[PDB]
Structure formats: C-alpha cells, structure tokens
Design a protein around this nucleic acid. Structure first.
Ligand SMILES: [Mg+2]
Ligand SMILES: [Mg+2]
Ligand SMILES: [Mg+2]
Ligand SMILES: [Mg+2]
Ligand SMILES: [Mg+2]
Ligand SMILES: [Mg+2]
Ligand SMILES: [Mg+2]
Ligand SMILES: [Mg+2]
Ligand SMILES: [Mg+2]
Ligand SMILES: [Mg+2]
Ligand SMILES: [Mg+2]
Ligand SMILES: [Mg+2]
Ligand SMILES: [Mg+2]
Ligand SMILES: [Mg+2]
Ligand SMILES: [Mg+2]
Ligand SMILES: [Mg+2]
Ligand SMILES: [Mg+2]
Ligand SMILES: [Mg+2]
Ligand SMILES: [Mg+2]
Ligand SMILES: [Mg+2]
Ligand SMILES: [Mg+2]
Ligand SMILES: [Mg+2]
Ligand SMILES: [Mg+2]
Ligand SMILES: [Mg+2]
Lengths: 75, 113, 133, 60
RNA sequence: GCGGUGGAAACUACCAAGCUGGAGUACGGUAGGGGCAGAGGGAAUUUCCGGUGGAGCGGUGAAAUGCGUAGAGAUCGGAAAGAACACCAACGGCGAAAGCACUCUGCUGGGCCGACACUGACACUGAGAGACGAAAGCUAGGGGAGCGAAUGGGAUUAGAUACCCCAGUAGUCCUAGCCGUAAACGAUGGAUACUAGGCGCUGUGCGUAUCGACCCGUGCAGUGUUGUAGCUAACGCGUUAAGUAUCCC
C-alpha cells in the first residue's frame, strides 16, 4: 500500500503515533517511562525530516505543510 | 468456537452467600447478563457451580448493617467478550452488591508453553 | 566499519596472531588491489574470491607456522597510517621505507595503488595507506 | 517425565494442589522440575485461587 | 612557505545515477516485579470494648528503669486504623540509570525473533542545552500502627554527652512541588569490526522426536561461571575483554 517504507509515510506514522501519545501524556503526567519513548520517536521523525530536506527540498516542504508538522529549526 | 471482532475475552468468578434461593440467584444472573450486554458484550456465556465450602471464613457487611460470616459459597463463572473500556464499572458494580461476597475477574490469554 | 582499510588489515593481523592460515575478508577495489600487491610482495600464500547473497569474500591463505606454533621467531606485522582522523601524504623525497627496505609501504597515488619501490621508479608521491613488516 | 498437557488455571485444583505444600506453601521450581514459564504461571494461579478461597493461605 | 601556469585522477572532497549487509518502517508472533492510574486480599502487629483468670509481666552478660490488684501479661470474642507484601525467590525477569514483586483490570514505553514486504546511508558520537535521577532534607495540606534521629529515664564505666534496656518527637506513609547529591560501583563512556574452547540459564526460530510434552542437534538475542591466544606493574581481564584496530566525548 503506497510505499510502507517511503520517507513521507514513515514521517506520517511517527507524527500520528506522537499526537496519539500526547493524550496519554496529558492524562497520566507521572509516566516518565512513556515520555522517554515519546522523546525518542520525535527524535527519529526529526532526523528523517532533516534527511529529506537534504535529499529533496520540494517533497520536504510539501510534507511538513501536509502533516501540519512544525517548521524546521534550521532557519 | 469463539471469535471476538475488536473485543477482549474475559472470565469472571463471583462468590455469593449460601443463604440464597435459585430465584434470587437467577435474578442476579439476569441482572449482570444485562449489564454485560448493555456494555457491548457479544457472547454472554454464564455457567454455575454453587455451594462449596470455602478455604477460609470471609466476612461481608450488608446495607442493612449485618455482619455475615460465611463458610460455604456460590461460584458463578462468566466467559464474555467486552470492550476493554467497559470492564471498568462491572467490577465495582459487583463489589457494591451485598449478595456478592468475593468477586474477581481475569483476562484470558491463549496458553502457549 | 568507519574505516574499511584498517579493518581488512586488522582481520589479517588477528587471524595471523592466532595461527590460522585462512581468513575471510570483504572485497572492494581497494581490498582487492591491496591483496594483489600483498601477493606480488609475497607476504601471503594465495587469494581467491567467493560470492553469496551479493556479498564478495576474499579468502586468504597465510604463510605456514614457523617450524611449530609454539616456537615462532617471526610474526607478520601491519600498521595503519593515514586514517580518517589524520591523513598522511608524502612527496617523492619523503616516501617512507620500512626497516631499510625489508618491509613495504603501500601508497595510493595518481597512477593507482603501489609499493614504495614503484613510486620511486616512476617519481610519484601520494597518500600512505599502511606499512607492512 | 511429569508434564502439563492440560491448560493450567486457578480452577484446576487437582493440579495446583500437587504443587502446593502441606502447609499450603508454594514449592520451588527446582523441586517441581518445571520450566520457568510454567512455574511462574503456577505461582500466579495459586495466588489467585488463594484470594478466591479455593485454596487456603494458612490452615485450620 | 606563498603566488601563477601545464599535467595525473588512486584516495579524501564535490556532482549525477545506482546498490543492500549498516539504520529504519509495515506485517505476524511471544516473554517480562518496565511505567502511570483504578479496583480488591490476607496474615502479623498496636490500641480500644467485653468474658475468663488472679501475681507477676517485660527485659539483660547480670540487673534496674518500665507495665501490674484501679486486675497486668496469658487466652477467647469483637471492632478500628495504618504500613509492609511470608512461601514462590533462583549464582532467575524487565528497565537508560535510579530502581521494579500479594492479586487484578485498564492507558502506554521499549526489546527480541522470522519472513524480503518496503525506503535506500536516513549512520555513530555529542561542546553547550534538556529530561529523569536512592536516601536524607525542605515548603503546603493531609495521615500517623510499627520502627525510630533528637530527647528523657535506667544501667555499664575513671568518665560514657556511646554501645545495652525502658519509654519516645521529627521523619518514615499520601497528594502537589522544590532539592540533584551517594562506594549513583562492573569502582570498567559509547558504536563498529575481528580473534579457541568447556559447562550453564532466559527468551524465541529451524530440523529431528512424535505428529504433542519432552528429546535431541543447531540459528540468532541477552545473561552466568572456568579458561587458550593476547594483554597487564602484579592481581587479574579473557567474544559481556581490561585483547587486535577505527571514530566521537
Ligand atoms: Mg607539503
Ligand atoms: Mg604551487
Ligand atoms: Mg575517481
Ligand atoms: Mg549518492
Ligand atoms: Mg482479615
Ligand atoms: Mg490481655
Ligand atoms: Mg537487560
Ligand atoms: Mg507492552
Ligand atoms: Mg531505488
Ligand atoms: Mg554534556
Ligand atoms: Mg527534578
Ligand atoms: Mg524520601
Ligand atoms: Mg530541620
Ligand atoms: Mg522503641
Ligand atoms: Mg540519657
Ligand atoms: Mg514504641
Ligand atoms: Mg514529592
Ligand atoms: Mg559525585
Ligand atoms: Mg565514578
Ligand atoms: Mg533436558
Ligand atoms: Mg552473544
Ligand atoms: Mg567475573
Ligand atoms: Mg576467565
Ligand atoms: Mg588496563
């Protein structure tokens, strides 16, 4: 289905699992074990994005405008 | 065969006071079957084994204020498929009743050894 | 595998110190050429290539134990020089020579890989890959 | 030699009472010669049964 | 050494396209005291209310303080409260570390394994910076059985501001925060590659054994004990290196 390994699909799966995790992190604030994972996965997504910005400028801008991902920290 | 579509499998044991009749027992039966089915249970399968002496004496206070000391007990066994969301009230709803002296519920996992 | 050259070298050094004649190494233009050269200098018995799952392996036969394994007068040394951290180059008049010439120095130059001998004949300098005793 | 061919639970009392001491203590894995997985499952079972008063903590 | 010009193109760098074995994604499995939250459980202890009973209990190297005829302890029957979870438990399990174990349910973090299903170097490390971080401690509100700094009595002693005994407040517990230190120890930063074995365990996978439990041999992933090469000032370390090399702090 599409490419399940494609950059943009992966970044999506990540952004989505993160915004999902957000609710759990809001309800139970004392769970640090889970937050540590969040920070890890966010790291992954951020990496892929940096990579994709290097490789293709167009696909990148399209993607972060599409998935409502916050603009990059290289500015 | 049993096949849940987006549900969790469950077993529940309930222990009731020995002083009960079969009509009061079936009324409880009916009641809890209805709570389950009202909670989205597809397949309520109930089974009964009543009146066994307990390992140990248990005490239950009533709403009438009675201290009831038991020896025997009524074991009700429930296989049912409910959403993980809806198992929440059931357990307390079992605790709250004066007729239910000891309740416990288990999730069932497939055995692979 | 930050450095590939160093790694080949190491697999040799290790298999050597443990008295085994046979080594598996992973091939590459560099690897292959270096091993060729190693053969024409004569530090190693025989080379050959293998392939599986799109992987290439040069197996190296190695010079037999010295008149037993316990009593070894000689080992076969190897040393990385230009390495990712610091790359060493040399002109024609600084070209290294090893133990008065008993050992050999490998150079990558404009004309390809060679020993110091070749570099002196042709008058070329370049990047010094490693030394061999 | 000895083995579990039947699903072990808290309601197979025959089973669990094999692996229980006279005093109702749980016997160790080294004694019962069970795989670690088994032993754990037994243990939790015994505790659950103990709560449901199917088997006693202490004796009479 | 700097500057101009003419050549070479291996290696670093650049530019264009490719490739999976590195790193990930999906898919399917499976073990687990991972974490947060919510239910439920029983011993034991302490106090209180009774019945019995009627001189000592309790404690120490030996004593005494103490508790007791206003009925102690002992024993049976009641309630009530808090805290900790016997056996399992193991030279076992998960966790980044701190740590995590009566039971259960729910929300969720990782791990590992087998398949090409996919992307195609997306890697490793990390100055600054951020999060977590035993116990003691602190602010605010609760809670207060046991234990117990401080404190007091009793001893012991030349003395005893100690060790022992009798009491006993903070604190230990919960909620919301601060503090950021420990022999926070493997006294061993991280990643990758590569180099005998023997005996063990945990997870899975394969073939065999039966056609389901073993069983065997094996493939991985981690974990434990001896030990060869090699290393080391010795002790020792030894595929989980303190070995042979590369990179960053
Ligand atoms: Mg120069
Ligand atoms: Mg010049
Ligand atoms: Mg070229
Ligand atoms: Mg490229
Ligand atoms: Mg009780
Ligand atoms: Mg008394
Ligand atoms: Mg571990
Ligand atoms: Mg999980
Ligand atoms: Mg492609
Ligand atoms: Mg720092
Ligand atoms: Mg903090
Ligand atoms: Mg504290
Ligand atoms: Mg103070
Ligand atoms: Mg005390
Ligand atoms: Mg004093
Ligand atoms: Mg006290
Ligand atoms: Mg706090
Ligand atoms: Mg320090
Ligand atoms: Mg230190
Ligand atoms: Mg066996
Ligand atoms: Mg291993
Ligand atoms: Mg050791
Ligand atoms: Mg050793
Ligand atoms: Mg050292």
């Amino acid at each position: 289905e599409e490419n399940k390994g494609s950059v943009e699909f992966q970044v999506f799966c990540f952004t989505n699992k993160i915004r999902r995790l957000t609710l759990h992190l809001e309800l139970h604030k004392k769970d640090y074990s889970s937050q540590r994972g969040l920070r890890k996965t966010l790291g992954k997504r951020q990496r892929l994005l940096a990579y994709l910005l290097k490789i293709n400028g167009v696909r990148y801008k399209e993607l972060i405008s599409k998935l409502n991902i916050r603009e990059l920290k290289t500015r | 065969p049993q096949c849940p579509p987006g549900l969790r499998q469950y077993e529940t044991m309930a222990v009731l006071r020995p002083d009960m009749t079969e009509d009061e027992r079936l009324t409880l039966t009916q009641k809890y079957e209805e709570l389950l089915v009202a909670g989205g249970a597809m397949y309520v399968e109930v089974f009964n084994r009543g009146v066994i002496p307990l390992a140990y004496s248990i005490k239950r206070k009533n709403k009438a204020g009675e201290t009831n000391n038991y020896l025997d007990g009524i074991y009700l066994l429930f296989t049912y498929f409910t959403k993980p969301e809806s198992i929440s009230p059931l357990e307390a709803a079992l605790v709250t009743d004066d007729d239910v002296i000891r309740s416990s519920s288990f999730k069932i996992r497939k055995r692979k050894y | 595998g930050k450095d590939t050259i160093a790694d080949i070298i190491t697999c040799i050094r290790n298999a050597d110190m443990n008295r085994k004649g046979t080594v598996r190494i992973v091939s590459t233009n560099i690897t292959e050429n270096i091993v060729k050269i190693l053969l024409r200098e004569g530090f190693i018995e025989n080379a050959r290539k293998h392939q599986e799952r799109n992987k290439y392996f040069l197996v190296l036969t190695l010079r037999h134990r010295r008149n037993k394994k316990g009593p070894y007068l000689n080992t076969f040394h190897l040393k990385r020089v230009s390495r990712p951290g610091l790359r060493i180059y040399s002109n024609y008049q600084r070209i290294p020579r090893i133990l008065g010439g008993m050992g050999i120095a490998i150079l990558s130059t404009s004309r390809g890989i060679m020993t110091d001998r070749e570099a002196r004949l042709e008058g070329i300098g370049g990047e010094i890959l490693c030394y061999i005793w | 030699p000895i083995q579990s061919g039947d699903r072990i639970d808290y309601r197979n009392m025959s089973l669990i009472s094999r692996f229980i001491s006279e005093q109702g203590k749980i016997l160790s894995r080294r004694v019962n010669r069970l795989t670690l997985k088994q032993q754990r499952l037994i243990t939790s079972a015994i505790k659950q049964a103990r709560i449901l008063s199917l088997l006693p903590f202490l004796n009479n």
